[PDB]
Design brief:
Its EC number is 2.7.3.3. The chain is an alpha+beta fold. It has helices at about 10-25, 30-35, 35-45, 55-65, 80, 85-95, 145-160, 180-190, 195-200, 245-260, 335-355, and strands at about 125-135, 170-175, 215, 220-225, 230-240, 265, 270, 285-290, 310, 325-330. It folds into 2 domains: about 1-100, no CATH class; about 100-359, no CATH class.
Amino acid sequence: HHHHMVDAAVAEKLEAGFQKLQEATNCKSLLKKHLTREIFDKIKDLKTSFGSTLLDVIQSGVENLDSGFGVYAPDAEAYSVFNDLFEPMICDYHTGFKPGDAHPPRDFGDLETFGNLDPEGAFIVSTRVRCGRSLAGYAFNPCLTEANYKEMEEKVVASLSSLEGELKGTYYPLTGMTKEVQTQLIQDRFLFKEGDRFLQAANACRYWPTGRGIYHNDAKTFLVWCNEEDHLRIISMQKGGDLKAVYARLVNAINEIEKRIPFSHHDKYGFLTFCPTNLGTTIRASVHIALPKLAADLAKLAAGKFNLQVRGTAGEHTEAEGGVYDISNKRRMGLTEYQAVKEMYDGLQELIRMEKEAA
């Protein structure tokens, strides 16, 4: 496909979408904020080599005006071709990253500098680190062919099936998934299903459920989703606060996978993903921590000095311990994997120190 020229159908649909954006003077999306007429007029007739147009970028945010972000990348090249829109959006969303920055190369860092977090079990309820990856060479969802989905899944399965030791586990395809397995995966909170209206409207569920599946280790402390939104979503998690173990498991897993499957990467934006909220390190770390003494003061948002975000957790007495907060990394881009996780580690250590010291 050539870099220019969209057909008349695409052009008409883009203009109507832009107008809908405009008349919705109520719309809070990043798409509406950043897709100015000037930018729209500049990029509306461009296509990637896969044939993706601006409509394949913005259609979800147009159809779902309540979108928070409102664009997706239909293939890795969209990030360059439609960069006039992607760049301001990405840089608005991602704390500490600005136009002209180059996201640093991957570096998981020295695992030995993590570890002793809450061995007592007095504070941290659970620890989780999620990452995402696209496979080098493949389009993203709106552009994948049925044979692409099958081939990608075969490759992913070959790699996960070869995993040994702590990562050894089972792959469950969505194709022909039984009621029994569906139920078991729902109990585990491991099941995904056809995407919500945001993903449907992005054409991200074509050929469902071909090439979609779920892998977890026997311990249920390592989970992979194949083709849920990104080619790969990779999660390490467990009860308690052993961030070293959680992070080491994920690092080992990603290194083993990459030995067999190279990832899509970008010199400025880091690992490329279908949703640009997942760029850079792609890291989404989350620790549930009980801080009932600090809960009184909410000068807790201390966490900010380590670039960490604090969120309350739901439930009543009968369900959940009180004063438990979800602590996560605000930074995904413009820092290495090691810096992102060490920020969590350092900040949590301080929070706990503060909790022990509070009256």
